[PDB]
Amino acid sequence: SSRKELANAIRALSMDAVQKAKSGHPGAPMGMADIAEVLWRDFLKHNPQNPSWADRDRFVLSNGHGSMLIYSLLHLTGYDLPMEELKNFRQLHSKTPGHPEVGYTAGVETTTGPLGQGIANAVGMAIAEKTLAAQFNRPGHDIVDHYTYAFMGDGCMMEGISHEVCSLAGTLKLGKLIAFYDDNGISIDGHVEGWFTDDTAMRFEAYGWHVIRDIDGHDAASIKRAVEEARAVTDKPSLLMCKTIIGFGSPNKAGTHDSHGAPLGDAEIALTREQLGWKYAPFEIPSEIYAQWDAKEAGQAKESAWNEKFAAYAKAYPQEAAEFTRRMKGEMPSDFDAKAKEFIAKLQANPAKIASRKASQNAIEAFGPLLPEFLGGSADLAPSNLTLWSGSKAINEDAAGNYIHYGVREFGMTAIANGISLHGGFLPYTSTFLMFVEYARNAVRMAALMKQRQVMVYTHDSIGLGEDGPTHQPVEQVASLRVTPNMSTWRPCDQVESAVAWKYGVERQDGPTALILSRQNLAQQERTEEQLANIARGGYVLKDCAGQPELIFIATGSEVELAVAAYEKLTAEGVKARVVSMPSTDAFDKQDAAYRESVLPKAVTARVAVEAGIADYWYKYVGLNGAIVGMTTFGESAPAELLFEEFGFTVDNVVAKAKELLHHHHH
Amino acid sequence: SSRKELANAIRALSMDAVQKAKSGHPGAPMGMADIAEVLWRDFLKHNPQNPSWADRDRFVLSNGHGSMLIYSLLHLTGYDLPMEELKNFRQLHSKTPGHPEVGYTAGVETTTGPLGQGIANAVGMAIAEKTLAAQFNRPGHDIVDHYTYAFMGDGCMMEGISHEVCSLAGTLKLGKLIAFYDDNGISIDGHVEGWFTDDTAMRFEAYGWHVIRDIDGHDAASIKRAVEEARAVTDKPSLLMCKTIIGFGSPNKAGTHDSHGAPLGDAEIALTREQLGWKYAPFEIPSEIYAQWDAKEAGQAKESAWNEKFAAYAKAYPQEAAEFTRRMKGEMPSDFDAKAKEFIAKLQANPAKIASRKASQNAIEAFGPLLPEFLGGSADLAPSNLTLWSGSKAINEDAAGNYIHYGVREFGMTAIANGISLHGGFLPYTSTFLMFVEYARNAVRMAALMKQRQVMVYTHDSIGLGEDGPTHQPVEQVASLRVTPNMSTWRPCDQVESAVAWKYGVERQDGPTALILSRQNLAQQERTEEQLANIARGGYVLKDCAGQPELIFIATGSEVELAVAAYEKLTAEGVKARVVSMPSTDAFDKQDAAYRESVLPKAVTARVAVEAGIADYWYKYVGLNGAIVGMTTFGESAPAELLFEEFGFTVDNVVAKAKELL
Numbered sequence A: 001s002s003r004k005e006l007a008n009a010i011r012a013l014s015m016d017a018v019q020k021a022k023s024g025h026p027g028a029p030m031g032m033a034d035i036a037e038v039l040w041r042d043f044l045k046h047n048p049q050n051p052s053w054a055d056r057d058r059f060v061l062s063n064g065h066g067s068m069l070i071y072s073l074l075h076l077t078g079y080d081l082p083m084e085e086l087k088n089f090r091q092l093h094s095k096t097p098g099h100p101e102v103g104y105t106a107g108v109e110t111t112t113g114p115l116g117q118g119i120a121n122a123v124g125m126a127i128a129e130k131t132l133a134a135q136f137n138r139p140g141h142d143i144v145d146h147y148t149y150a151f152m153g154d155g156c157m158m159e160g161i162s163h164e165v166c167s168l169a170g171t172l173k174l175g176k177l178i179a180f181y182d183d184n185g186i187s188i189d190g191h192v193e194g195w196f197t198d199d200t201a202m203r204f205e206a207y208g209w210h211v212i213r214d215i216d217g218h219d220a221a222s223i224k225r226a227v228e229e230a231r232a233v234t235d236k237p238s239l240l241m242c243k244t245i246i247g248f249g250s251p252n253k254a255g256t257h258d259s260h261g262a263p264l265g266d267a268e269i270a271l272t273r274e275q276l277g278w279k280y281a282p283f284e285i286p287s288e289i290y291a292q293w294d295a296k297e298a299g300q301a302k303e304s305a306w307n308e309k310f311a312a313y314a315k316a317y318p319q320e321a322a323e324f325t326r327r328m329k330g331e332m333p334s335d336f337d338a339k340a341k342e343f344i345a346k347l348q349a350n351p352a353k354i355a356s357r358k359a360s361q362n363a364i365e366a367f368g369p370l371l372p373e374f375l376g377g378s379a380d381l382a383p384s385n386l387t388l389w390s391g392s393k394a395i396n397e398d399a400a401g402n403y404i405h406y407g408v409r410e411f412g413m414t415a416i417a418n419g420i421s422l423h424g425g426f427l428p429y430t431s432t433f434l435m436f437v438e439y440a441r442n443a444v445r446m447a448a449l450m451k452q453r454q455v456m457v458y459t460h461d462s463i464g465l466g467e468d469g470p471t472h473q474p475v476e477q478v479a480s481l482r483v484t485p486n487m488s489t490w491r492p493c494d495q496v497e498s499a500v501a502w503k504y505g506v507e508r509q510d511g512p513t514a515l516i517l518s519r520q521n522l523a524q525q526e527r528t529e530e531q532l533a534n535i536a537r538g539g540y541v542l543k544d545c546a547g548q549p550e551l552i553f554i555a556t557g558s559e560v561e562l563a564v565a566a567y568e569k570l571t572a573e574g575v576k577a578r579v580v581s582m583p584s585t586d587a588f589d590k591q592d593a594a595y596r597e598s599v600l601p602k603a604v605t606a607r608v609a610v611e612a613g614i615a616d617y618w619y620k621y622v623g624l625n626g627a628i629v630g631m632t633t634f635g636e637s638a639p640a641e642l643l644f645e646e647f648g649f650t651v652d653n654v655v656a657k658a659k660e661l662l663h664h665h666h667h
Numbered sequence B: 001s002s003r004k005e006l007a008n009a010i011r012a013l014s015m016d017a018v019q020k021a022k023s024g025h026p027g028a029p030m031g032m033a034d035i036a037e038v039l040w041r042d043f044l045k046h047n048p049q050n051p052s053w054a055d056r057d058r059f060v061l062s063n064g065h066g067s068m069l070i071y072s073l074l075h076l077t078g079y080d081l082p083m084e085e086l087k088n089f090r091q092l093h094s095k096t097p098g099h100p101e102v103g104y105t106a107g108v109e110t111t112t113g114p115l116g117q118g119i120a121n122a123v124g125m126a127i128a129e130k131t132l133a134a135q136f137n138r139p140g141h142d143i144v145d146h147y148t149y150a151f152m153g154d155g156c157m158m159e160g161i162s163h164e165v166c167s168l169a170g171t172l173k174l175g176k177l178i179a180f181y182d183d184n185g186i187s188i189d190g191h192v193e194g195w196f197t198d199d200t201a202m203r204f205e206a207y208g209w210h211v212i213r214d215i216d217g218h219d220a221a222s223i224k225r226a227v228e229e230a231r232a233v234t235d236k237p238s239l240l241m242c243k244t245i246i247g248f249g250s251p252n253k254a255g256t257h258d259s260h261g262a263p264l265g266d267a268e269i270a271l272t273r274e275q276l277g278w279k280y281a282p283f284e285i286p287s288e289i290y291a292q293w294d295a296k297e298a299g300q301a302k303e304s305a306w307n308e309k310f311a312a313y314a315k316a317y318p319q320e321a322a323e324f325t326r327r328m329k330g331e332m333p334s335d336f337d338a339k340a341k342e343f344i345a346k347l348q349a350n351p352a353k354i355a356s357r358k359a360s361q362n363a364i365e366a367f368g369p370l371l372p373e374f375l376g377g378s379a380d381l382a383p384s385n386l387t388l389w390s391g392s393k394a395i396n397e398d399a400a401g402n403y404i405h406y407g408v409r410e411f412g413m414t415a416i417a418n419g420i421s422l423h424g425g426f427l428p429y430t431s432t433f434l435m436f437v438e439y440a441r442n443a444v445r446m447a448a449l450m451k452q453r454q455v456m457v458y459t460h461d462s463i464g465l466g467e468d469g470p471t472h473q474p475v476e477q478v479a480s481l482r483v484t485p486n487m488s489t490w491r492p493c494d495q496v497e498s499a500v501a502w503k504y505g506v507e508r509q510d511g512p513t514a515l516i517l518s519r520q521n522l523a524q525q526e527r528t529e530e531q532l533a534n535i536a537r538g539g540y541v542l543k544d545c546a547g548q549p550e551l552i553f554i555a556t557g558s559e560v561e562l563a564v565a566a567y568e569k570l571t572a573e574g575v576k577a578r579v580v581s582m583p584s585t586d587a588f589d590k591q592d593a594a595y596r597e598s599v600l601p602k603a604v605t606a607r608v609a610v611e612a613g614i615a616d617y618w619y620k621y622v623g624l625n626g627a628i629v630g631m632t633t634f635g636e637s638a639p640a641e642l643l644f645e646e647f648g649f650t651v652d653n654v655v656a657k658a659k660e661l662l
């Protein structure tokens, strides 16, 4: 078959699958089919029979609405994605969801759909390869050596996140990153000139990319020459400007916004078959075409060669090889649990009243020698977030390092870290002030959706930060994280809860963990062995009374100290009170019914929540017959101690609100 | 005095105020003082006696941590910002908060601090000036003619939002936008070359900006020449690459990250006074320096000249002049309330089962002829969000238009719209799929913080959107909006609630309004006159029983129909059931307690919330002894009908959960 005929197989499967689903996006798959045929058949290093091969090239579809493009490629090249699944495109529980999802489907590297985040993930995968190669490669043993290829469109280019990640990719001279721009002149509103007029080549040159202009995206020879040129440039990431026609093949819809996002229709599909010379019925592919598309034999051979290379590496570097295998699997060091518990116990036995941002740094310092897989960073706030430990080494200084200066790029940072976690070999941590999680919000959600391990270090968590004022002072951000499916959120009250939360985060294999950390010093609380162990259960009894409590305080983070003081005052006056520390609502909710009842007994309705965050959240635990000492407004610019006074975070006010509540209950 | 001495007054006030507060950022004010002296003294058209003058130039400090720069400028030029306020920098309830805040302080145009958003706001202000000029100017009567000036640093440049808004500014040929880049080579982590290496000038030329390279930011002559050149280029926004030294004047801290964000210290301040040759004590400014800085006389002359121009315009164009005054004040047409109510009443009398995204478009169509101040748009989703009406005219085609194609730029769109609202003259609406509010989240927050009127049209609100799947299907986004201070959030259940929500949004004078709208068709509910009037109260009794209810359903948006169906089944069994429609929790919460008690009586604890969004929100209204039929997970890719079934949005499940409570 000709290269065009082979590319047309993608066009047919894509338009036909969209038609059967009566839903989906045929335009981009039809526009990019020739580029995909060249990349996948001539260049991509992969094994369909082992999608987890450590040294495979990584491909990312950033314009993820063109999902049938990747499903066609995976099916045709011999991945475990049967034709029946393509016939079930966009149907419940199929392996072919409307936008591609990692874990759902053999060979899908990341979940896309939100424009711009795919290219960010690809930048992270390229950083991971570069860093892992520098750490593990040895003379005569280059066990890490693979490319990262990304497809992206106008939407990804317009999004601000593309600026963040492609700027940083230039700085880091990511020579194994090669991106293909689907330059088709069309977006949803129509011809892009009305809203998008960048000289995109000049923009990427400004970032230090190697740009290849004016590629005929429908000419295999032109595409191939461009890819070869990009592969020859080892010191810059490359952008291939591929001029394509959206919906290529459709006489009446090619080059129009109509082809972007809806079924072509049966009449137009018939006309498209005629234009393309594609004779086969929907979901029919002849054996001859499979023979040319299949990658099982080449894939086997390439992986077998790599396995032999790895075996030789293991002979010469046994400890390094064991570390490589452990880290690629995401497994923890065998002695980590014991060593982390020893650290936690030491902290409980040796009180220190320090900011939880500092307690976080101390945990990084303690874990750093144990977790060489750390690849950590901050969005230009290293001296504020406290993300550097004594063994930190920035990768812009030494490629074998373990730290990334992300610059003022919160969204880019977080989506890059998603790419790092997806790659394998590393445990990423990222950091900014909690407020600026709002800049990165959808990337945080994507880590949770993709079930990725990433520790998110969010400092300066409340009005406790003081003078910087209401644009910086979080109020409603923690509640936003708490209600995010599969997110874990910890607001530790002292250095001990901080270390427990850090341990929980690094050991959490199936989702991310956000640490909500203070600028200001936090009092250490006293704990029995049982209470110490109970921190990890998310919510636990910290102070108690004999018999049923009349009153339960529920507090988090910096406000536990305040709740304990109120508990002491009320106790001295003969009130039967309890304090529950709730460092993680999500972990508490995951405990069984009996444990939750032991902490928040259903009989006790006089419940007082205390937290310098939005009050409305706390109805979940206090119900309609309690009280909340929280925030209901934005903050103010002033010294923190005056803000806590102003907003009612005082012993006198907490005691007054508790007594007021009890008075209401009694009458 | 020399220009350097005049600029040094800013340096002294800034380092001294930071020192007294033991908090703040002296570096950028000291680095930018010479640029500020040239811009403010030689070019800026403003009146300190009236910071609200309609035709003033707008200045924006995008690198807002350098707040003492703007406070120094406002004080020195004669705004109502006394020295005592500068001595109360960063102190409770002062007019000098740590980052500048619009409303707090005479002359502050916007609230900055979140990097990148200032330049976005400035792009919005320049769009507003260009559009207002095209709408209102007439031959011989150019009543709108002013510049938008912005200062910005490396942080703003690194942020993605700068790419979004500066790209669009190039497309729109904003020739009266002039930005100054504080090119000082330093950020918090240290020397920027480790993380920021863009050829920024080349980048901005790629956007179609006019770029002036290699300006000596400490030389008045160099700066002045560059501003003149930028003002001569009328068809492109301009970027001035100003090479500066952060903390300029400090022998030991200039050019270091140390000067960025902390007091210099007493010893270093003494050395700085020596290096600068500044002989005045903290908070001492001599009369000669005030005399050269003060702008009261020139400002009043310029505004008076403009007032005379406006009076002549009003004689020639009385209807247009009245519209200008109304729109600049943000006032609504006197008959808008009556006309909108007439539209709402018509919808209730003429039922239609349509998507609330379509009901939204219909409200835009109804209101369009009444609100010429609309400046609306969508982030590349016009045919999906349904933001065009018959009178929409895109400003890239017709400068006097009322519609913006924002491109795939949610964050930039929203912060641009903040600039549009801050400018005066317009009522902006913006739009994208609800999920992608997450891309714009901090700009949404900033609209609320700044008390700005903007209608945010968020369609495709739930699993009801169907096949696009969990990356697109909102679950927890509405809950996040609901707990945002000063945000109004409406999730209408039909075309009637949709029009009421739109009316509420445009009539807000002090904050934004998010509309939570469906992809799929929603059934219209029957309403009495009292129920119809009570939609605007945010929560109301839609279906009832005789006497005290035994069971109350609380539902929103697309789930009201489901709750009504459950109510009908239980009513037939003889349960005293009620359905409450809760289109807006914030509007409900603001009602008097007697009204709230009439809808959700305190004695009735058997409450079932029904909404295709995160369950945890609803404890606010159901407490610990109710039930919630909600989402607790991400969505899935499948047809909407099958998703609603899969996730428990069925009559059987709603009835079963209700029967558990009873």
Ligand SMILES: Cc1ncc(C[n+]2c([C@](O)(CO)[C@@H](O)[C@H](O)COP(=O)(O)O)sc(CCOP(=O)(O)OP(=O)(O)O)c2C)c(N)n1
Residues within 6 Å of the ligand: A027, A028, A063, A064, A065, A066, A113, A114, A115, A116, A153, A154, A155, A156, A182, A184, A186, A187, A188, A246, A260, A261, B379, B380, B381, B383, B384, B408, B436, B439, B468, B472, B519
């Ligand atoms: C961050 C972000 N913003 C907007 C979108 C929306 N959007 C996207 C989608 O959501 C697909 O992913 C929509 O096509 C929805 O499926 C439409 O839903 P219905 O109207 O059928 O209900 S795609 C997109 C335009 C992308 O333009 P491109 O130039 O990137 O792509 P192409 O040349 O058209 O291949 C835009 C603007 C997104 N996916 N991500």
Ligand SMILES: Cc1ncc(C[n+]2c([C@](O)(CO)[C@@H](O)[C@H](O)COP(=O)(O)O)sc(CCOP(=O)(O)OP(=O)(O)O)c2C)c(N)n1
Residues within 6 Å of the ligand: A379, A380, A381, A383, A384, A408, A436, A439, A468, A472, A519, B027, B028, B063, B064, B065, B066, B113, B114, B115, B116, B153, B154, B155, B156, B182, B184, B186, B187, B188, B246, B260, B261
């Ligand atoms: C969207 C966003 N991200 C990060 C920041 C943090 N940030 C900022 C601030 O927040 C000031 O606004 C911090 O200086 C905090 O005051 C520090 O708090 P503490 O450590 O004293 O507790 S400024 C900034 C770096 C800006 O670099 P630039 O090059 O823009 O500014 P300059 O040359 O240093 O004038 C960076 C990175 C921000 N303001 N906005």
Ligand SMILES: [Ca+2]
Residues within 6 Å of the ligand: A153, A154, A155, A182, A184, A185, A186, A187
């Ligand atoms: Ca396109």
Ligand SMILES: [Ca+2]
Residues within 6 Å of the ligand: B153, B154, B155, B182, B184, B185, B186, B187
């Ligand atoms: Ca700087």
